[PDB]
């Protein structure tokens, strides 16, 4: 039971550290969105980067 | 009778030792409150810590 409690506490730590991984209302690791695209050329072509939910 | 008196003395000592467990008048040991939340983000998200009466 003590190991169960420790395991659950570490689980909660993972969930909270994952949900805290924001940067200016946008996060690539929390799973809020499929992907993020940043400007890559003055034409407006993007720099595609896929989200990796953790 | 001597062992009974020693047991009663230890019991009074243990009660008062449980009573004195406080930090700035706030405690988690004596069970005065069910739980203490703690800050985890700039949004005010808590860190729930259920009290365990001892």
Swiss-Prot record, chains A, B:
Organism of provenance: Caulobacter vibrioides (strain ATCC 19089 / CIP 103742 / CB 15)
The family this protein is said to belong to: Belongs to the bacterial flagellin family.
Superkingdom of this protein's organism: Bacteria
Subunit structure of this chain's protein: In C.crescentus, the flagellar filament is composed of multiple flagellins of 29 kDa; 27 kDa and 25 kDa.
Function: Flagellin is the subunit protein which polymerizes to form the filaments of bacterial flagella.
UniProt-recorded name of the protein: Flagellin FljK
Cellular compartments annotated: Secreted; Bacterial flagellum
């Amino acid at each position: 039971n003590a190991l169960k409690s420790d395991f659950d506490s570490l689980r909660d730590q993972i969930e909270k550290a994952a949900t805290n991984a924001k940067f200016n209302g946008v996060s690539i690791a929390d799973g809020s969105t499929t992907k993020l695209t940043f400007l890559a050329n003055s034409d407006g072509s993007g720099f595609t980067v896929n989200a990796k939910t953790i």
